[PDB]
Model the fold of this input.
Amino acid sequence: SMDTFITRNFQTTIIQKAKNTMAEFSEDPELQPAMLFNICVHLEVCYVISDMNFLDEEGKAYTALEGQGKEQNLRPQYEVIEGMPRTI
Amino acid sequence: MNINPYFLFIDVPIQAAISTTFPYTGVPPYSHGTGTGYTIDTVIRTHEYSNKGKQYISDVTGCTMVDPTNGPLPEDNEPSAYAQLDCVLEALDRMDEEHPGLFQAASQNAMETLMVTTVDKLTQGRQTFDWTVCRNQPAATALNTTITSFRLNDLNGADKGGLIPFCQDIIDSLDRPEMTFFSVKNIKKKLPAKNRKGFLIKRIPMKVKDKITKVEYIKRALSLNTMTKDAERGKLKRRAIATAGIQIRGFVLVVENLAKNICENLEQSGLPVGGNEKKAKLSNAVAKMLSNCPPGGISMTVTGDNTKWNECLNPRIFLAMTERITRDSPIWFRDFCSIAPVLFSNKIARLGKGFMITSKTKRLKAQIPCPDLFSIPLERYNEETRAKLKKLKPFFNEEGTASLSPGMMMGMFNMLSTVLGVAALGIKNIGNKEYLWDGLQSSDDFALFVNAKDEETCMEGINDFYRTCKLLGINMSKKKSYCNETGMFEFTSMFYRDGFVSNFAMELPSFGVAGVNESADMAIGMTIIKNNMINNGMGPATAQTAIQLFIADYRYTYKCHRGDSKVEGKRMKIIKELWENTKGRDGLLVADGGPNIYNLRNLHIPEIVLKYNLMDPEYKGRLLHPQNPFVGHLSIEGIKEADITPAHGPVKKMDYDAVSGTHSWRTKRNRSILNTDQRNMILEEQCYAKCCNLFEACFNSASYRKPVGQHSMLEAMAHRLRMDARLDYESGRMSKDDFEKAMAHLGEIGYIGS
Amino acid sequence: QVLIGDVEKGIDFKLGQTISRLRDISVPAGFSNFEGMRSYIDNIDPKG
RNA sequence: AGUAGUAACAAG
Done:
């Protein structure tokens, strides 16, 4: 089972954003899971590069901690354009 | 000496003075009270023309169904619905021969357009029957109430954006064992009143949820709303008209789009062509037939009228037409095109408000609704109604509706019915007889040109055409049709006499104050004059008098007489002050008590543009104030488009050129119903408006270009404002504190939307 | 094996029980069902 | 009464 694989290994956010971008390109995830994986991996890798890399008031690159509130760090170093709806 | 107005026709040919025969300064006829009498007439007549066909019970709705198609051929000259499939198919085959690849081309274009068509397309319709409230609402309202109600039954095909997945939900909804929908019910509060009855009933409508069974829903989805046609010209007696639901509109759109593609390429179609393009086409067709007349022979023109057109045409025939037209098409598209005719084949007519019974002695009146139509003995109805209801019985449903399988009461297949008419014209000859026929077809209107050796042989062709039409379910009116040697005829109220003559009277009611606003109405008024000079033979003397008449009407309508006039009025009091306070009075608009400077040469120039350089900079500053409170949220339609109502035809939109100013206002929505509190309905309207305005605040292009996306409005608005904020902070337009507040607020919004 | 080793997306328009039955009883006099109507129109030459 | 004209209004 291919569908069962992509469910367990990947995150719930990553799956949805992939299936929604596949729908925008008029492709069916439940019938063509070959594309579903490649988008999920490509999104995961994109999020790996962006994750926890922020910019402070002087414009310098620091990394945050999984726990620190979303009030402290407001400006990520990267803008993840991949995964967003076409028009956004 | 006694004047006789008909004596004009001694000195002037009737066509040359045809305008004088149109009494379009008179009041057009309006209906009063119920349309049930007229609707029941249609239900009875429609069944009278098919009664010799197959009668059976629908195993879906339990309705009484009549099928005249492939029925017995008529033995009289009464309206016949007994169309022979074979003859229809032979007519369409002969069209396919004369237009090779047209049927597949039309089917391809129509299919490709459908694959590109989005759900919002259905908002471009007029008044639509809303099955959720069992009343007529605008197309955009009926669509919304259907989409939102469909969500309560796990039907979210609308969210995909394309028409096809929405249309998939529409046919799939017929399978749902029960349908939950958003309806409206009103709370009654009995108040005191200064009248005979002594009291009052104040209603407060509120949004509710209502549940209906599958059969109940199917009946609603198949149902037509019926009312009487008001302000129709050239007719002594009123007639019933019908409005279809929102469900069928998507399917009809594609079938009409298919028929349009065919009609466009048919030499004898007067549809979808209109105005000057039609005139040229007809004039060419007349010149052809004149030159192609056998020498020593005669050419004759039938000024053609069809009778019971809609009553006799049959959805089952259109179902066959869609089938034969989409021959070489993908099964899905053939199946798509098949649905509109199938829904019409099983359509149910709502019978309106019912009949009113009264006591002249006790001075009492009561409305008997359609469900209760047989709750009283038929002796208590008048002779006409007693007869109607007796003939209605077999087609009557318990819930006050009627089964109406045959006929096309709603219309909506004007192009496809034209294709059928052009099919008949396309036959040209029967049995290799010594005549040829051709013509023009615009829906139920036709002109037939017949060429032969003598008029006796021409009449044989007309008789063969008459008979051929009966086989397609088309009934030529012998009462309203007439024939003569080619040179003159009438077609869709256009009059030919060695060329098309002007018919000024047809356009006369359109010269009045349109009733959009004082800005638009000025442009519209002047444009109508300009266009009637070009098209409808209005000379310079009449054109100039029209300018005067229009300004007279405008000044009295908008109470905006000349500042130097001594006319009493609340507006006039301030106009008189504005007149005194202003130096450049030539610059003042007619609506501001200013002078009229319009003449023939400048009819096409917006009034503000004409007067701009003559205006006082204080007046010009006020008039054109960019943030004035009279102009609301303007749509691209709002500025350019205006619905103009001709004497003859459907209500069409016309373009006008006007500068946006304080006169470009809009009247309050008709939320002024007696003893009704609309507070709930108004809040719903204001909620959608708030959401749409704020969306336009984030996306300024929305007003101009249609926004695209299957994602939430909120998701789009949040992402935009998040970027706005970040790039306002990193540019130094927004302060560090404001950015923190913004991103904090956006964090709460981000949570609410997931 | 699945990753290392593009189907044609045909347009989806399925007719349910109710609409199919409505179409079957929407046929001219002579036909048992719609399938019979579609075949006839497609296959027979109505010349003469 | 009257308007009107195949059905209404003459307030709710």
Summary: The two ends of chain C are 62 Å apart (CA to CA). Residues 34-43 of chain C form the longest helix (10 residues). Chain C touches chain A through five residues (CB under 8 Å).
